């Protein structure tokens, strides 16, 4: 059964039919500051929440390639949700991929870790940055993406990557005024296009306010 992890924003959660889905990949498009990395940091904490509070009751794994992982942000989100800051940090496993080979190798370690402890989320920010001969890189990336799908299938974790299989949800983020941001989703038998506004704060992703 699927678990939907809260993004911290009621509007964004509604757009996502509940939140970030375990068992599949959510691919977010946008540059740093559009909210993609902020969403990742928020999810690394909310995935630890009790299921009734919108969490996945599991640990988070964060593979960074940009050098933008910030433990202090996790502490702020933890305080916001009334969670132990120390426990939250101990429950987020982090690694920085040095190159594309390392990026893929980390998935083997990830799989071993998921056998030992319960994880609810795997973040890869960014899944493509290190890839930017050409055909060789494209095949390697394709393999990497299929491996992520296998992990989601095998362990039932939500896989969120920043930058497709039928189960992949693609989110296109853009800047709004000030701290507000907009997320847009496409081709949906329910609606051709749908959008939701959210905000990035010191303590994570929240709803946009006037």
């Amino acid at each position: 059964e699927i678990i939907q992890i809260t993004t911290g924003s009621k509007e964004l959660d509604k757009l996502l039919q509940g939140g970030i889905e375990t068992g599949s990949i959510t691919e977010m498009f946008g540059e740093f500051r559009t909210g993609k990395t902020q969403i990742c940091h928020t999810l690394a904490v909310t995935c630890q929440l009790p299921i009734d509070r919108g969490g996945g009751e599991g640990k988070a794994m964060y593979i960074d390639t940009e050098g933008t992982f910030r433990p202090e942000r996790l502490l702020a989100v933890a305080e916001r949700y009334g969670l132990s800051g120390s426990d939250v940090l101990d429950n987020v496993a982090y690694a920085r991929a040095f190159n594309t080979d390392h990026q893929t190798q980390l998935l083997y370690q990830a799989s071993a870790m998921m056998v030992e402890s319960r994880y609810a989320l795997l973040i890869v920010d960014s899944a493509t940055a290190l890839y930017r001969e050409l055909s060789a890189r494209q095949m390697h990336l394709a393999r990497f993406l299929r491996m992520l799908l296998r992990l989601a299938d095998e362990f039932g974790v939500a896989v969120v990557i920043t930058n497709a299989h039928a189960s992949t949800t693609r989110l296109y983020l853009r800047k709004g005024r000030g701290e507000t941001r907009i997320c847009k989703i496409y081709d949906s038998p329910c609606l051709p296009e749908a959008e939701a506004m959210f905000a990035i704060n010191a303590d994570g992703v929240g709803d946009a306010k006037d």
Binding site: P71, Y94, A95, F98, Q109, E116
Partner: protein
Amino acid sequence: PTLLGFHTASGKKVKIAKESLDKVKNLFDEKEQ
């Protein structure tokens, strides 16, 4: 090679049992069915 593995956000190295790695050795194979 601490730089190539995982650490908790609090800076603690994450230990992985050799058996655990062995158990998932074939997880990513795309063998013909």
